[PDB]
Design a protein around this ligand. Sequence first.
Ligand SMILES: [Mg+2]
Ligand SMILES: [Mg+2]
Ligand SMILES: [Mg+2]
Ligand SMILES: [Mg+2]
Ligand SMILES: [Mg+2]
Ligand SMILES: [Mg+2]
Ligand SMILES: [Mg+2]
Ligand SMILES: [Mg+2]
Ligand SMILES: [Mg+2]
Ligand SMILES: [Mg+2]
Ligand SMILES: [Mg+2]
Ligand SMILES: [Mg+2]
Ligand SMILES: [Mg+2]
Ligand SMILES: [Mg+2]
Ligand SMILES: [Mg+2]
Ligand SMILES: [Mg+2]
Ligand SMILES: [Mg+2]
Ligand SMILES: [Mg+2]
Ligand SMILES: [Mg+2]
Ligand SMILES: [Mg+2]
Ligand SMILES: [Mg+2]
Ligand SMILES: [Mg+2]
Ligand SMILES: [Mg+2]
Ligand SMILES: [Mg+2]
Ligand SMILES: [Mg+2]
Ligand SMILES: [Mg+2]
Ligand SMILES: [Mg+2]
Ligand SMILES: [Mg+2]
Ligand SMILES: [Mg+2]
Ligand SMILES: [Mg+2]
Ligand SMILES: [Mg+2]
Ligand SMILES: [Mg+2]
Ligand SMILES: [Mg+2]
Ligand SMILES: [Mg+2]
Ligand SMILES: [Mg+2]
Ligand SMILES: [Mg+2]
Ligand SMILES: [Mg+2]
Ligand SMILES: [Mg+2]
Ligand SMILES: [Mg+2]
Ligand SMILES: [Mg+2]
Ligand SMILES: [Mg+2]
Lengths: 114, 68, 155
Amino acid sequence: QVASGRAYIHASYNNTIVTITDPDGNPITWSSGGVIGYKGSRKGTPYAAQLAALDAAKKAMAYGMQSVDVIVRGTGAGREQAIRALQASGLQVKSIVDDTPVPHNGCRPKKKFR
Amino acid sequence: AKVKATLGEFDLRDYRNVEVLKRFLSETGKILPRRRTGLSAKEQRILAKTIKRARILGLLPFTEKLVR
Amino acid sequence: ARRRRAEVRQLQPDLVYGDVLVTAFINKIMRDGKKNLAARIFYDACKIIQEKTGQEPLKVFKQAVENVKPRMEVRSRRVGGANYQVPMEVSPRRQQSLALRWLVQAANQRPERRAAVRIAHELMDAAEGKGGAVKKKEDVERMAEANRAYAHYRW
RNA sequence: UGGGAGAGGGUGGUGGAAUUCCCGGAGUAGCGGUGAAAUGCGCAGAUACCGGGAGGAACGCCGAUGGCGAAGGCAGCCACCUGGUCCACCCGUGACGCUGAGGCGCGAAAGCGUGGGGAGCAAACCGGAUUAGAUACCCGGGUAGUCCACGCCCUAAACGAUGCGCGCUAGGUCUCUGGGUCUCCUGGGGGCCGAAGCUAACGCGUUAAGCGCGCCGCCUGGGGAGUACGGCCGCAAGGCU
Ligand SMILES: [Mg+2]
Ligand SMILES: [Mg+2]
Ligand SMILES: [Mg+2]
Ligand SMILES: [Mg+2]
Ligand SMILES: [Mg+2]
Ligand SMILES: [Mg+2]
Ligand SMILES: [Mg+2]
Ligand SMILES: [Mg+2]
Ligand SMILES: [Mg+2]
Ligand SMILES: [Mg+2]
Ligand SMILES: [Mg+2]
Ligand SMILES: [Mg+2]
Ligand SMILES: [Mg+2]
Ligand SMILES: [Mg+2]
Ligand SMILES: [Mg+2]
Ligand SMILES: [Mg+2]
Ligand SMILES: [Mg+2]
Ligand SMILES: [Mg+2]
Ligand SMILES: [Mg+2]
Ligand SMILES: [Mg+2]
Ligand SMILES: [Mg+2]
Ligand SMILES: [Mg+2]
Ligand SMILES: [Mg+2]
Ligand SMILES: [Mg+2]
Ligand SMILES: [Mg+2]
Ligand SMILES: [Mg+2]
Ligand SMILES: [Mg+2]
Ligand SMILES: [Mg+2]
Ligand SMILES: [Mg+2]
Ligand SMILES: [Mg+2]
Ligand SMILES: [Mg+2]
Ligand SMILES: [Mg+2]
Ligand SMILES: [Mg+2]
Ligand SMILES: [Mg+2]
Ligand SMILES: [Mg+2]
Ligand SMILES: [Mg+2]
Ligand SMILES: [Mg+2]
Ligand SMILES: [Mg+2]
Ligand SMILES: [Mg+2]
Ligand SMILES: [Mg+2]
Ligand SMILES: [Mg+2]
């Protein structure tokens, strides 16, 4: 059982993941689109993150969680609405930070990013 | 809110002037252009290289997390 | 249409209870423009409903419609290679239009033999909360909420 | 003589972010992907998280209508070696100059040989989909190759589809870097609109496509064809004529 923790939102074109970690970073519970019962582009939807982010939080606090610092990575249309319900969930949302990764012109991407 | 006015004399080559140099890096650690720094051409260029060198010495960051 | 916002036909309130709402319902009743006929089966049903329910059936059907008023329906939006049942806050004019279209629709569904019989019987149930009349609404409002993932596609 | 700016070129060191895999901790029912789906990956524990390690490649913001280069082309930081170039002072030589068939050297990508290297990506290839069909467009894998060293290969929308040098012909606004006296004036580049003038028109116009002088290359209907023959070059594919 833990009261304060973390929350990472992997926001992608095709989906959105919500995994909650202990203060050290060890995951304690997680959730994303399909977990609530969606398959396909419907996953790439904010309302998914809601249930996703929500269903992850709900399960989280069941272990004693009450506070978590927020971490968001990616450029997903389901991103912000996920940040929403988390706040409007039942957790103190102690902070928000965007650690979205970005190279400095490193590896080449696939054909469809050029 | 251009910055060059915010300061007076100061060495574009004092590649150790963190407290000053770190003033031109947006709160996301990025270098800030010229519509935002008030620096000119030759000026502007002489900066970064100064910043960069420090950003290699361990003084300035290559990037920073963002807080809302 | 393409020009501006169409107008709302205000009807001539009924000649019995002094209401335009009543005036609206008989229309749906009224087939082949047989207002006298339609006007009957209504105030006739208004009789049976009275006998089996001794409260002013004016209120009865004043109630059994709100119970029929759907708050959210779905509407198909085909953005890109797919059509999305984008749900929308149903409109007032339409809600009356929606409630005014299944009672009769569900009344005409009903198996009892006489017109004023059925029409009345659908009146009561909705005043309680029973019957396919409430079914459509019920089914409608939740498929939407069953599609709450498309409200950002709203209009 | 004195300076200035710059991704000019070469060697050696080097700095951080991200992708991929390996190892460790925690954790659960799906991740990924698309217009929608599927192949594919996942209870043999994936996806998203934290921590450590290995390896390769390209250098985010600065950065831009910018800069340098004869061209192709050049972009993290550092130092060394080196080229071209501009400004001023107007110090020296006193026409020493321009052009340049031949010759020589350079020459993006792909490709070739030898020996390394191999993370990401990715021709052929396999697979899954769309299709009447789909040897394709979209998706999942994936070999050469893209990277380094030394050799070749010498082509292209190698474009400004505009050869090089000089002299003459209104200006206006923007930008790079110099010099001044610092309002502004003057040199050299980079764009824009436009004087006259040219031009078949679209357009160019002190970076000419304007009026001129010199020299080189080049065109002479379309296709056949940049093919055949011969000759040269080359390991070959193929190049030149
Ligand atoms: Mg998806
Ligand atoms: Mg591999
Ligand atoms: Mg593991
Ligand atoms: Mg890791
Ligand atoms: Mg850029
Ligand atoms: Mg340019
Ligand atoms: Mg003299
Ligand atoms: Mg003399
Ligand atoms: Mg010459
Ligand atoms: Mg070559
Ligand atoms: Mg090459
Ligand atoms: Mg070979
Ligand atoms: Mg061989
Ligand atoms: Mg090899
Ligand atoms: Mg491989
Ligand atoms: Mg592929
Ligand atoms: Mg076939
Ligand atoms: Mg097939
Ligand atoms: Mg195929
Ligand atoms: Mg691949
Ligand atoms: Mg080979
Ligand atoms: Mg081969
Ligand atoms: Mg090769
Ligand atoms: Mg090779
Ligand atoms: Mg040649
Ligand atoms: Mg060009
Ligand atoms: Mg040129
Ligand atoms: Mg040509
Ligand atoms: Mg000429
Ligand atoms: Mg000056
Ligand atoms: Mg000029
Ligand atoms: Mg013009
Ligand atoms: Mg004219
Ligand atoms: Mg002429
Ligand atoms: Mg010029
Ligand atoms: Mg020539
Ligand atoms: Mg002929
Ligand atoms: Mg001919
Ligand atoms: Mg050819
Ligand atoms: Mg031959
Ligand atoms: Mg040939």
